[PDB]
Amino acid sequence: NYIERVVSINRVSKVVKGGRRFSFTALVIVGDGKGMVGVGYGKAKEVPAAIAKGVEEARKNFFRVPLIGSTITHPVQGEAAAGVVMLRPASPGTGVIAGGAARAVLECAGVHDILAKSLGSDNAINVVHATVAALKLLQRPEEVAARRGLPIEDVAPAGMLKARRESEALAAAAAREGSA
RNA sequence: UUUGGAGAGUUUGAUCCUGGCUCAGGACGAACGCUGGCGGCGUGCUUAACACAUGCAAGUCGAACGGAAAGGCCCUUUCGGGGG
Ligand SMILES: [Mg+2]
Ligand SMILES: [Mg+2]
Ligand SMILES: [Mg+2]
Ligand SMILES: [Mg+2]
Ligand SMILES: [Mg+2]
Ligand SMILES: [Mg+2]
Ligand SMILES: [Mg+2]
Ligand SMILES: [Mg+2]
Ligand SMILES: [Mg+2]
Ligand SMILES: [Mg+2]
Ligand SMILES: [Mg+2]
Ligand SMILES: [Mg+2]
Fold first, then answer.
1. Which nucleotides of B are covered by protein (CB under 7 A)?
2. Which nucleotide has the least CA–C1' distance to A158?
3. Which DSSP string do the residues of A36-54 spell out, in sequence order?
4. Which partner for A114 in A96, A105, A159, A160 could form a disulfide, CB atoms 3.0-4.6 Å apart?
5. Tell me, which GO biological process terms does this entry list?
6. Which nucleotide comes closest to A20 if you measure CA to C1'?
7. Burial level of A130, CB count in 10 A (0-12/13-18/19+)?
8. Could you tell me which residues come within 8 angstroms of residue A133 by beta carbon, excluding any fewer than 6 positions away?
9. Measured distance CA(A159)–CA(A149) in Å, rounded
């Protein structure tokens, strides 16, 4: 099961000797719900073809973002493209709060508690570029410890240690429920 | 070791940036238009620190003192009232 959300259908026109030629380009994000993000932006001659190309591009370009429980690990300064976006993991039930493209990508990724705030040049394409860059700029505590040659207890705080333990127990319970 | 960030529209043939304007919310000691049933609970001259008809919004102590205008009492009465 995958998710596709229409974010921005746009009209473009090109000029040659006879006059103006109109055109379409669209952007769409695809995700599985466990932390897999896929974006695709393409041009076409009409909405259905545009969406088809967008879905193809999204499938081709994927990414995996390790999540903790049901929220991001630490706050992310998403600097790229032309906009500036900042993110902050949240407590549960609060939800994932951001602007349009931010919410598109995040709900595609499957998160349910996060805070974001676009900080200039909100054009949807650049915003999504920045979100993807920030999301790939995340760090996994286990790999951080592995790189630093330091162990999990000493590297990671007890709070997120217990959070990860509870998430693991919940995942085991869900797997048992599914198998049974 | 715990609480908590929304953008959208508008330049161009078409984008991107910057930048300007406008809107989606809460709040009023608020006023006007329409509507209108009760009860509960607060609130109520922000401008003219403008002049202000009337009355209310500062009184208590004879066991501090002299006295008795009006009343209570008794001696009196011509019923004017006279003593304490
Ligand atoms: Mg910088
Ligand atoms: Mg560059
Ligand atoms: Mg900007
Ligand atoms: Mg903007
Ligand atoms: Mg709070
Ligand atoms: Mg315009
Ligand atoms: Mg312009
Ligand atoms: Mg134009
Ligand atoms: Mg009325
Ligand atoms: Mg009432
Ligand atoms: Mg009242
Ligand atoms: Mg006195």
1. 1-8, 13-19
2. B1
3. BEEEEEEEESSHHHHHHHH
4. A96
5. translation
6. B13
7. buried
8. A78, A79, A80, A81
9. 21
